[PDB]
Amino acid sequence: AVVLSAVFMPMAFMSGATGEIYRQFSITLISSMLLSVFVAMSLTPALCA
């Protein structure tokens, strides 16, 4: 998740309509692994306990 966030980090600092289209992938992805790394270490341990 850290590596994916890093590689997708500098995509959101360039403009353009195609860039704005690619934001609809990039921002959702960085949010995706950020939520994933939150939930895997936070929520699932509580359940399995």
């Binding site: 590596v3 994916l4 590689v7 995509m11 353009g16 309509a17 195609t18 860039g19 690619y22 992938f25």
Partner: protein
């Protein structure tokens, strides 16, 4: 009457407005909104929108003195009512309306000569119509003491409904219009009934010094970036993309007489603006994804040196693919990389892949059944998704079994 008499069992309301249309406002334009009963009463596919539209086409093709074209609202009503290419024929050479019309007809003839490339090419504007021209002998009117301004104002007021001022009606301000009566402005002979006052105060009819003739004129004029133009529509031929036919039409225009340009608008402009910059963004995205597949397994370590061979496969790879699939291929490469990852990092494979073969098919099926809601209502639209899906799942299972083991020795 046709909608509310022959198919009363599926239509709810018919709202027809005359004098309006998407081509503009005019006496010969017609438009109709149709409302259908709710899905509870519309059962089966025979009462669906498509079947009723097809029946409407078949029944209304019999309208002899009009062109009735029932159609469904498109998926994106903000971009037009159909697909294909949108083209503007620019007269940047200052040639004139007639020369541009001749050029447009020549382009249509040339396009019709090669149906294997472009299909259904047609103009969008309206054709020329007969128009009435009144010629006023200014010298003759001036000889008998009648001002030309009076004649022009008389004609314009009589046939044009000149607006005067406002008045109050039930507490609201509303306009006041002055025009000739209905039975006085319907025929060309009606002009001879009009009179105008001279300087002496007497009256002389308009027929004394005015001559009328029939000419032709354009009922609708189109401009693009301040340059006169006429729109041209059409769709690419079957089995062909948009770019090839678009370039072919560009060459066709290059064959037109000098002074005539061209330009793309609407969807075609968007795709052209995407295409001329697509290679650079695709190259930088490929560099970024290469860094992604070069940073995780520490440099050319084990698999990332075989992913170094991936660019050769990419360069090896007229058939095309849409914008969504261009990112879908990258996501497929990424998910294959991840299918390798949680075993390759463990190696960084026997036990790891024994306990991680299951996640391969969970992720594959999760992606498949997550893109499934985009297309499916259950039952319908499922037979055509088992061709690519099953083959890709089998290929991914084989890749998990073999490649993460051959690549280490490779």
């Amino acid at each position: 009457d046709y909608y509310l008499t022959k198919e009363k069992d599926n239509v709810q309301s018919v709202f027809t407005v005359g004098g309006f249309g998407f081509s503009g406002q005019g006496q010969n334009n017609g438009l109709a909104f149709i409302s259908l009963k709710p899905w509870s009463e519309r059962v089966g596919e025979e009462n669906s929108v498509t079947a009723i539209i097809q029946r409407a086409m078949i029944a209304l093709s019999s309208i002899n003195k009009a062109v009735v074209f029932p159609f469904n609202l498109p998926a994106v009503a903000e971009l037009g009512t159909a697909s294909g290419f949108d083209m503007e024929l620019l007269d940047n050479g200052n040639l004139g309306h007639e020369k541009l019309t001749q050029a447009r007809n020549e382009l249509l003839s040339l396009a019709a000569q090669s149906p294997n490339q472009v299909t259904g090419v047609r103009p969008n504007g309206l054709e020329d119509t007969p128009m009435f021209k009144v010629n006023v002998n200014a010298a003759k009117a001036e000889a008998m003491g009648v001002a030309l301004s009076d004649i022009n104002q008389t004609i314009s007021t009589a046939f044009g409904s000149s607006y005067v001022n406002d008045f109050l009606n039930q507490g609201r301000v509303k306009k006041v219009y002055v025009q000739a009566g209905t039975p006085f402005r319907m025929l060309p002979d009606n002009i001879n009934q009009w009179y105008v006052r001279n300087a002496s105060g007497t009256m002389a009819p308009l027929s004394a010094y005015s001559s009328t003739e029939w000419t032709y004129g354009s009922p609708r004029l189109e401009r693009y970036n301040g340059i006169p133009s006429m729109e041209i529509l059409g769709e690419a031929a079957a089995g062909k993309s948009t770019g090839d036919a678009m370039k072919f039409m560009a060459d066709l225009v290059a064959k037109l007489p000098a002074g005539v340009g061209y330009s793309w608008t609407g969807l075609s402009y968007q795709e052209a603006l995407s295409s001329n910059q697509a290679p650079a963004l695709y190259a930088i995205s490929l560099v970024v994804v290469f860094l992604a597949l070069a940073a995780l397994y520490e440099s050319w370590s084990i698999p990332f040196s075989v992913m170094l061979v991936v660019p050769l496969g990419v360069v090896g790879a007229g058939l095309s693919n849409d914008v969504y699939f261009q990112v879908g291929l990258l996501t497929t490469i990424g998910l294959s990389a991840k299918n390798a990852i949680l075993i390759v990092e463990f190696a960084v494979i026997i036990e790891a892949a024994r306990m991680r073969l299951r996640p391969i098919l969970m992720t594959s099926l999760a992606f498949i059944l997550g893109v499934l809601p985009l297309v499916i209502s259950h039952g319908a639209g499922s037979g055509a998704q088992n061709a690519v899906g099953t083959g890709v799942m089998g290929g991914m299972f084989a890749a998990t079994v073999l490649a993460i083991y051959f690549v280490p020795v490779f």
